[PDB]
Design an enzyme around this catalytic site. Structure first.
Site, PDB file in Angstrom:
ATOM      1  N   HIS A  61       0.821  -1.237   0.144  1.00  0.00           N
ATOM      2  CA  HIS A  61       0.090   0.085   0.047  1.00  0.00           C
ATOM      3  C   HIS A  61       0.925   1.130   0.135  1.00  0.00           C
ATOM      4  CE1 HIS A  61      -3.363  -2.580   0.655  1.00  0.00           C
ATOM      5  NE2 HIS A  61      -2.843  -3.197   1.729  1.00  0.00           N
ATOM      6  N   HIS A  91       4.612   6.494   7.354  1.00  0.00           N
ATOM      7  CA  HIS A  91       4.783   6.383   6.070  1.00  0.00           C
ATOM      8  C   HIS A  91       4.266   7.355   5.446  1.00  0.00           C
ATOM      9  CE1 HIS A  91       0.673   5.736   8.099  1.00  0.00           C
ATOM     10  NE2 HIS A  91       0.278   6.179   6.811  1.00  0.00           N
ATOM     11  N   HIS A  93       1.591   9.093   1.832  1.00  0.00           N
ATOM     12  CA  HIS A  93       0.698   9.004   0.527  1.00  0.00           C
ATOM     13  C   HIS A  93       1.092   9.811  -0.372  1.00  0.00           C
ATOM     14  CE1 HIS A  93      -2.132   6.727   3.307  1.00  0.00           C
ATOM     15  NE2 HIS A  93      -1.635   7.610   4.510  1.00  0.00           N
ATOM     16  N   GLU A 103      -3.874  13.269   1.663  1.00  0.00           N
ATOM     17  CA  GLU A 103      -5.168  12.827   2.106  1.00  0.00           C
ATOM     18  C   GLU A 103      -6.026  13.972   2.738  1.00  0.00           C
ATOM     19  OE1 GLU A 103      -4.176   9.141   4.597  1.00  0.00           O
ATOM     20  OE2 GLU A 103      -5.016   8.236   2.531  1.00  0.00           O
ATOM     21  N   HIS A 116       2.587  10.561   7.515  1.00  0.00           N
ATOM     22  CA  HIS A 116       1.968  10.039   8.669  1.00  0.00           C
ATOM     23  C   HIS A 116       3.030   9.523   9.801  1.00  0.00           C
ATOM     24  CE1 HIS A 116      -2.000  10.165   6.329  1.00  0.00           C
ATOM     25  NE2 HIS A 116      -1.885  11.359   6.895  1.00  0.00           N
ATOM     26  N   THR A 195      -6.822   6.426   7.850  1.00  0.00           N
ATOM     27  CA  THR A 195      -7.250   6.516   6.297  1.00  0.00           C
ATOM     28  C   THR A 195      -7.271   5.090   5.550  1.00  0.00           C
ATOM     29  OG1 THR A 195      -5.196   7.125   5.767  1.00  0.00           O
ATOM     30  CG2 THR A 195      -6.594   8.675   6.750  1.00  0.00           C
ATOM     31  N   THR A 196      -6.901   4.066   6.080  1.00  0.00           N
ATOM     32  CA  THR A 196      -7.181   2.938   5.394  1.00  0.00           C
ATOM     33  C   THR A 196      -7.833   1.587   6.284  1.00  0.00           C
ATOM     34  OG1 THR A 196      -5.229   1.780   6.129  1.00  0.00           O
ATOM     35  CG2 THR A 196      -4.654   3.068   4.247  1.00  0.00           C
TER      36      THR A 196
END
Ligand SMILES: CSc1nc(Cl)c(C=O)c(Nc2ccc(S(N)(=O)=O)cc2)n1
Ligand SMILES: [Zn+2]
Length: 256
Positions: A61, A91, A93, A103, A116, A195-196
């Site tokens: 991901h 991690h 995004h 995000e 994040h 958020t996942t």
């Protein structure tokens, strides 16, 4: 399984994870004019001096930089938080293009990426227990814009070739996450979620106002990662972000 594609992406998640349509989902748009300054909010205490990074993992991901969270080594306190939250991983995004990838958004503005730093509340003993609690996690979110390089990011960038595909990991000791912070710790905060999937409503979000600058070359290298495992057709790891979700019955507070 869930992912970020047309067939398994954010619009599909609610089928396996009905909380996707819940009352405190993340991310959200931060409407800067509606966010209220809260003079009761404390400065954010980021204590990363004793941080012990261990490993970097492509999880299919994003990639996680993992920390030793078996002692109070890298902790987040203060701000909106009661108690002590331990850093477990960070991690990012990011997008396929510089104009998308974050995000959270700010007055509908999308940044190129979002970092994040994930912390869990020590009063719950472990991360797995913490995610089952409304105040289990604190995630420090930091926007990335494309401009000058972030020197403190380069060690991450340079290891990515060794974790190209899902399930690959590499030793990543002695990384100092202080090198990923902006100058100011001014922030917005609101109650939200992962958020996942599993999209658990366990996060106090703390989103820094000041973005960090990364170079086009640095983000280009993020985009060379793969969602797929080794020996599978190449799917570039890009656009691994969830869109802004309904704010519903929530207030975003500003520390400034
Ligand atoms: C991504 S796979 C995955 N699977 C499981 Cl089972 C968990 C359990 O917690 C998890 N954690 C997680 C932590 C932080 C964030 S975020 N993007 O809100 O900072 C998202 C997911 N991630
Ligand atoms: Zn995240």
């Amino acid at each position: 399984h869930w992912g970020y594609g047309k067939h398994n992406g954010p619009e599909h998640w609610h089928k396996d994870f009905p909380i996707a349509k819940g009352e405190r989902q993340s991310p959200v748009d931060i409407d800067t004019h509606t966010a209220k300054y809260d003079p009761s909010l404390k400065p954010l205490s980021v204590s990363y001096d004793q941080a012990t990074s261990l490993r970097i993992l492509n999880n299919g991901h994003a990639f996680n930089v993992e920390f030793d969270d078996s002692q109070d080594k890298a902790v987040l306190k203060g701000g909106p938080l009661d108690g002590t939250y331990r850093l477990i991983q960070f991690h990012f995004h990011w997008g396929s293009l510089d104009g998308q990838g974050s995000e959270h958004t700010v007055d509908k503005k999308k940044y190129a990426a979002e970092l994040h730093l994930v912390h869990w509340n020590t009063k719950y003993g472990d991360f797995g227990k913490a995610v089952q609690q409304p105040d289990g996690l604190a995630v420090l979110g930091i926007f990335l814009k494309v401009g000058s390089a972030k020197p403190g990011l380069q060690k991450v960038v340079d290891v990515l070739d060794s974790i190209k595909t899902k399930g690959k990991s590499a030793d990543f000791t002695n990384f100092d996450p202080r090198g990923l912070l902006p100058e100011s710790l001014d922030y917005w905060t609101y109650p939200g979620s992962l958020t996942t999937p599993p999209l658990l409503e366990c996060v106090t979000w703390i989103v820094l106002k000041e973005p960090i600058s990364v170079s086009s070359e640095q983000v280009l290298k993020f985009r060379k990662l793969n969602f797929n495992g080794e020996g599978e057709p190449e799917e570039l790891m890009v656009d691994n972000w969830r869109p802004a979700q309904p704010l519903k019955n929530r207030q975003i507070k500003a520390s400034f």
